[PDB]
Design an enzyme around this catalytic site. Structure first.
Site, PDB file in Angstrom:
ATOM      1  N   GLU A   1      11.428   1.137   3.783  1.00 49.43           N
ATOM      2  CA  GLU A   1      11.832  -0.203   4.017  1.00 49.43           C
ATOM      3  C   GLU A   1      11.837  -0.642   5.461  1.00 49.43           C
ATOM      4  OE1 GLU A   1      12.166  -2.498   1.761  1.00 49.43           O
ATOM      5  OE2 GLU A   1      12.330  -1.161   0.008  1.00 49.43           O
TER       6      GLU A   1
ATOM      7  N   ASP B   1       9.477 -10.486   2.940  1.00 47.84           N
ATOM      8  CA  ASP B   1       9.016  -9.210   2.493  1.00 47.84           C
ATOM      9  C   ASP B   1       7.545  -9.204   2.039  1.00 47.84           C
ATOM     10  OD1 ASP B   1       9.020 -10.237  -0.010  1.00 47.84           O
ATOM     11  OD2 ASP B   1      10.602  -8.994  -0.738  1.00 47.84           O
TER      12      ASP B   1
END
Ligand SMILES: [Cl-]
Ligand SMILES: [Cl-]
Ligand SMILES: [Xe]
EC number: 3.2.1.17
Length: 162
Positions: free
Chosen positions: A11, A20
């Site tokens: 991440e 994202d």
């Protein structure tokens, strides 16, 4: 290696709101804020999550806090899900971490929908599950990450992360 370290690798860490892989507003260590196109909305969810007027940016500690809460919620979600829990209790510690990673990324609902892979994992048919897991949108959209998770399920070791 552990679940925290593995997800921190998959991440990353970012202190200002960012979008994202799917274009959604996120902050910290993959903490999704909203699917809404609105940045104000994202800021609003952020402030609510932090408990202060952050103005789009947070500290490392605040980011770590969210991450802890998120990892906790992911395990809890697995344990509360009837299709997931059984799989999870049947797995060794390394493979459990792989399952948590997927839940963290895609939500319990989404992972609960990999019926066939879940059954193969439950039966300990590693290679087969790895082949089935790759036949998915998840694998075609984030192939590098998916390969690491898949390898982990296939081998039960952290080699993809070393
Ligand atoms: Cl939150
Ligand atoms: Cl990826
Ligand atoms: Xe899965």
């Amino acid at each position: 290696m552990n679940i925290f370290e593995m997800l921190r690798i998959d991440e990353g860490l970012r202190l200002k709101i960012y979008k994202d892989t799917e274009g959604y507003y996120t902050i910290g260590i993959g903490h999704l804020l909203t699917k809404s196109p609105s940045l104000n909305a994202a800021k609003s969810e952020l402030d609510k999550a932090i408990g202060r007027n952050t103005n789009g940016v947070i500290t490392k500690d605040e980011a770590e806090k969210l991450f802890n809460q998120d990892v906790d919620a992911a395990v809890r979600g697995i344990l509360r899900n009837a299709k997931l829990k059984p799989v999870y209790d049947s797995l060794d510690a390394v493979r459990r971490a792989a399952l948590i990673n997927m839940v963290f990324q895609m939500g319990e609902t989404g992972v609960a929908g990999f019926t066939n892979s879940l059954r193969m994992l439950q039966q300990k048919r590693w290679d087969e599950a790895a082949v089935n897991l790759a036949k998915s949108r998840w694998y075609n959209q984030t192939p590098n990450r998916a390969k690491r998770v898949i390898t982990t399920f296939r081998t039960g070791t952290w080699d993809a992360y070393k």
